[PDB]
Write a protein that binds this ligand. Sequence first.
Ligand SMILES: CN(C(=O)c1ccc([N+](=O)[O-])cc1C(F)(F)F)C1CCN(c2nnc(-c3ccnn3C)c3ccccc23)CC1
Ligand SMILES: CN(C(=O)c1ccc([N+](=O)[O-])cc1C(F)(F)F)C1CCN(c2nnc(-c3ccnn3C)c3ccccc23)CC1
Ligand SMILES: Cc1cc2nc3c(=O)[nH]c(=O)nc-3n(C[C@H](O)[C@H](O)[C@H](O)COP(=O)(O)O)c2cc1C
Ligand SMILES: Cc1cc2nc3c(=O)[nH]c(=O)nc-3n(C[C@H](O)[C@H](O)[C@H](O)COP(=O)(O)O)c2cc1C
Ligand SMILES: *[C@@H]1O[C@H](CO)[C@@H](O)[C@H](O)[C@H]1NC(C)=O
Lengths: 632, 634
Amino acid sequence: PPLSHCGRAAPCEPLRYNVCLGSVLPYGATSTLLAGDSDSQEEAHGKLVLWSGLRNAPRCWAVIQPLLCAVYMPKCENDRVELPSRTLCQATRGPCAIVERERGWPDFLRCTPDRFPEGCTNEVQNIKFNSSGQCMVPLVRTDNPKSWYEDVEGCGIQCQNPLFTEAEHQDMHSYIAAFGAVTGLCTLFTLATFVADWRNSNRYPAVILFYVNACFFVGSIGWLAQFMDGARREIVCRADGTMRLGEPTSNETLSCVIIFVIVYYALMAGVVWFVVLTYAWHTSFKALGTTYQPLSGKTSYFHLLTWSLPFVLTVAILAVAQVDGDSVSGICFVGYKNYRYRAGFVLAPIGLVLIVGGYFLIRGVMTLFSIKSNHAKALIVYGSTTGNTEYTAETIARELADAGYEVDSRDAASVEAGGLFEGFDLVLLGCSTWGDDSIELQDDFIPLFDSLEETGAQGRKVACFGCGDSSWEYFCGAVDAIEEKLKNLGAEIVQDGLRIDGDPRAARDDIVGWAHDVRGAIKINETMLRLGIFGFLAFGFVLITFSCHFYDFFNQAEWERSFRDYVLCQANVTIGLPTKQPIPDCEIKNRPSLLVEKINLFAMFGTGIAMSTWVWTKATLLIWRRTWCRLT
Amino acid sequence: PPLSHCGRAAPCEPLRYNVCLGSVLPYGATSTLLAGDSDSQEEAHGKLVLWSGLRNAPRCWAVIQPLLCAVYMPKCENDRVELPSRTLCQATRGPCAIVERERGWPDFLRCTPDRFPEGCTNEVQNIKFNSSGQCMVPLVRTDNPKSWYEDVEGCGIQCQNPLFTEAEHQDMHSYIAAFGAVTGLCTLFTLATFVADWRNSNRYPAVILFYVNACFFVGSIGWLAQFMDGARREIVCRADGTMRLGEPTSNETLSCVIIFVIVYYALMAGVVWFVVLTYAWHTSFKALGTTYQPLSGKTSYFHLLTWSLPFVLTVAILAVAQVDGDSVSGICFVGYKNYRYRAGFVLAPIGLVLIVGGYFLIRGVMTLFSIKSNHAKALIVYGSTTGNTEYTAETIARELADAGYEVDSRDAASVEAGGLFEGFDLVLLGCSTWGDDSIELQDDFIPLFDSLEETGAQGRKVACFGCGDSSWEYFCGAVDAIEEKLKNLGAEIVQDGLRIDGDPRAARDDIVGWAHDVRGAIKINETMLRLGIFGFLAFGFVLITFSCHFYDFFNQAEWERSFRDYVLCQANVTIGLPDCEIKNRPSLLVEKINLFAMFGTGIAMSTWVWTKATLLIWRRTWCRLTGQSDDHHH
Ligand SMILES: CN(C(=O)c1ccc([N+](=O)[O-])cc1C(F)(F)F)C1CCN(c2nnc(-c3ccnn3C)c3ccccc23)CC1
Ligand SMILES: CN(C(=O)c1ccc([N+](=O)[O-])cc1C(F)(F)F)C1CCN(c2nnc(-c3ccnn3C)c3ccccc23)CC1
Ligand SMILES: Cc1cc2nc3c(=O)[nH]c(=O)nc-3n(C[C@H](O)[C@H](O)[C@H](O)COP(=O)(O)O)c2cc1C
Ligand SMILES: Cc1cc2nc3c(=O)[nH]c(=O)nc-3n(C[C@H](O)[C@H](O)[C@H](O)COP(=O)(O)O)c2cc1C
Ligand SMILES: *[C@@H]1O[C@H](CO)[C@@H](O)[C@H](O)[C@H]1NC(C)=O
């Protein structure tokens, strides 16, 4: 028999509607007493149309359907209305959290033991509700609870990024394919020539560039993996069809974490190897100049920090499980869902490598500049009858002085040969050619030339100059004669002698140009100069990468808000009221800049392409020549 | 009955001496009236002893004996002395010319019709004078009037030279035999080789040497003829036994003129052929830069001069007849008796050949310092990283340039392999070795090395150089690799590669030395060089021959005087009244120096055919004349 507490006294009225939310009712009489907002059957039906807006977020729709029928259209028999049980009310509370977040549970729909008593026959339990509901365009029906997006239980955020169009996806994928393929090809070539000359190329100053290339090559594979037949969807989408978030996760393939490790580890190992490059260039200077020695046996110290620090970071990300997948970039990365993790694991280490790496580039430049000031003394000895070589000597003297040299210009007529060149870094000898039948040096240079053995030319950096006339046999013969004696004594001829035809005043810029080139030939370690250009080149690209990561960090807080606001509005679970126009009324107020990402990738992949040019010398042609030759 | 004019009135005195100059007198009384210098018989006898000094020069002694007896010891019978006939007086005048030349005929011995009447009975005509006189040691009795020495009629100068001993004659004859036989043998060998390959060897710059040898061969025969058994005495001595002087002479054998023509003609034809040799070298050496053959038409004009000039001179000597024989030299020559003819026909032509021949040798040395600077082209391509090979290349370049080459020094980095070697006589490739585990060529040389096929190396004269370090295994591996590829392409590697260990500045003179030796192995005209040495060699020997002939010319005037003074002194012809010696004579050493320089020219010129080619000439001669080919005949 029915319980007295499971029923309430109310006047029974015949059912004007034979259907409740698509399901037929076994009874013929109802009551508008249980629904506090409705007075009539026409009003209760009107409220059900507003409540049917919860079709979206179906895991709520399945439990809210019988409860709404048990309150708005209940069973009335012999002036008694059937009350809905407490279990029917409590079943909605969880999955229908959206109600309390949007509209709020009304007085009559809250689980009060007075309104919803314990252990009552629901009547709606016998009634079968076939209707399931569906998920709106941005979302997708997922059975997996781990794939449910916020409030909307039963639905999940789709794999393809809803903020960017298919056209933008195709455009970004073409951009990664182009840069990835070039960087992959270029670095492969560099790794190949290094192993083809492995015993010789293992020398510590240049071996850094092999490992710098190794990282960008491995990184290229991670970015290009998305291009294999259907790989992108194995890396970015979950088994059901929703985007991968908060990776490493249970009951899902490793395809996302594998590609993340390849991309992030190689990115971090590469930036640590850049700091090794900056340190090495900086320390190689003080090995010759002052006291510091080459660390050509630091294999167990450089490989220690370059392979350990990215390992600690990669392991830490998998621990906090912040590996998120993305369709536009086609890779799994740290902090796509939560911007804070991308800032902590990417922006902070890149900032640390720029300050530590930048310090070494500044230090080495300061060492380069201090060495040049200790090698800036120059002696200019000239032999001139008519003053043409005297004028050239003076013109050379100002160009060196303007460049930071301490020039000492002397006339050969007023000099003593014994120990003349002692205390000078550069010695420039100038002499005009005389003699009709033959080559005769200018009269004042003869005593110096004859006793050139006593000057201290052995190992001295020298260059010759002089004035002559083409209208004479043996043009600038003095320059030839001086260059020959200096070469025989052991001097280091810096440049081919400046031979002036005619009036030197008209060849002013030739003299200025020669003196410019003569300082240019003063080598401050050619083998180490390349290491410095590559250091400053890598810094430039790393600085652009940092800027782009800073833009995303400083703005993603607003983009995440806009992502939430758009997806939740598009979910169409407007329980409260019907819109003025059918109009969708959903827009993205602000989204991430794809240009900034393209600038980021250009700077990233560009470092790999820039560092691969380390092996773009004549020596490399010779390396593969021996290989082919010796293979044959 | 005796004529009144064939006798004079004088007091007869008995003969104190029964003998007159070794002959007994048929009468017993004499007179001292006919002899104007003698008053007594003791005085007349005393004058006969001074007159008996004319025993020497017997052509005179035989006729003066009866005349001296008919004047100093005449027949006196019944206070009448017999006068000597005019015919007895006139018979002495000719052969006793010495008397009138030295002392002069006295008043009583001159043929006056008063003192010597015509047609008188000379009682001395019945008296037989057995004495015939004598000729002292350097002279010898000759019946031939053409063989009589100066005033001494009946005697002639002996064949063997009185100024030189038999010991000196034997010594000089041994010296001529030795040099003559060697020169004869050596020149015969050279004449045989030029004939054994006449066609190939008839080339005109070199065929001069065949005719130069031909003259010394013929000359050798003339000098050696004296060694044929008894020949020397047929060449040097006249039929009687006196030395041959101014041969061509009547009723004497041709043995002296034959040997003279052989010796003098060959001596003169040889010195004219020396002037041809000097002229030919001078003109051929000058025309080396052009195909112009200067000795082309001249060939005929060369034989004209060399065979006519000695002929004209030989004929001229036979005309002036100054061919004199000599025992010490064993040959007949021009101007042995009169030094002036030897000076004119021997010293003057030899002086003329030295001034004309000397001019051409000078002109040829002027050509030597005109031609060197003018024509060799050399390319030096180097591969240098550290500048060591660049420095070596420059050191090599300045050395070739100093020697007269036109050097083109290039860096391998700035060269195109395609026909790179085209237009150069010499190509010098330089490269350093690189590579840690192996041999790797200097970086700039690799493109050139790889396309070395296209350089034009086939048959090109090349040499390699390069710097290395012994500290690295495979020292100068690049030098090895380059000359191996060059050898495989068909190039001519001139010298083994200059491989520098360490700094080339410390090995400067080694580079200088190597560069020098590289220039040498480039073949030159060895035939022209050889012609020039033989020209200067022949001049040297001719200059010594001239010196020796000048010594004899400048001194024989004194030697001729000493020859006359010594010979006439020994003779002892005392018309009426001891230290007989040679004051100065010719130097036999000077003659030995003369022969050494003369015969030495022939021996020196015969060495022209002392090459490897000659061995081949006689190899092909034997086989060819043995019927077989290089194995056996087909
Ligand atoms: C994350 N995100 C979203 O749209 C997004 C997705 C999910 C949620 N959410 O809440 O679930 C929120 C968002 C929002 F709020 F919009 F950000 C963007 C994805 C695209 N994009 C990129 N970012 N980095 C790189 C790059 C450069 C160098 N290395 N890498 C790794 C990169 C490279 C190529 C192309 C794009 C790139 C910027 C951020
Ligand atoms: C000439 N005379 C006389 O003694 C002589 C003879 C006769 C009178 N006289 O009045 O009747 C005078 C003299 C005198 F005054 F003594 F000289 C010497 C003879 C020997 N001798 C030589 N001279 N030439 C040659 C030779 C050199 C190159 N070619 N030839 C042909 C030669 C060769 C070999 C050996 C000796 C040689 C030196 C001179
Ligand atoms: C005697 C004489 C010889 C010369 N020989 C040469 C010569 O060998 N090579 C040459 O290039 N110029 C030659 N010149 C030109 C001078 O080198 C030229 O004028 C030069 O500019 C003079 O230099 P100065 O003014 O420094 O003394 C010669 C000029 C003279 C008058
Ligand atoms: C990497 C290296 C490899 C070398 N290999 C060789 C070698 O195999 N054999 C050798 O003789 N020298 C070798 N050397 C020495 C050089 O040939 C030497 O320094 C030379 O003088 C360089 O001359 P350059 O200035 O013309 O280039 C080597 C030197 C270096 C630095
Ligand atoms: C919401 O869903 C209902 C039912 O599917 C549909 O009629 C309506 O057009 C949707 N509204 C919007 C704005 O998407």
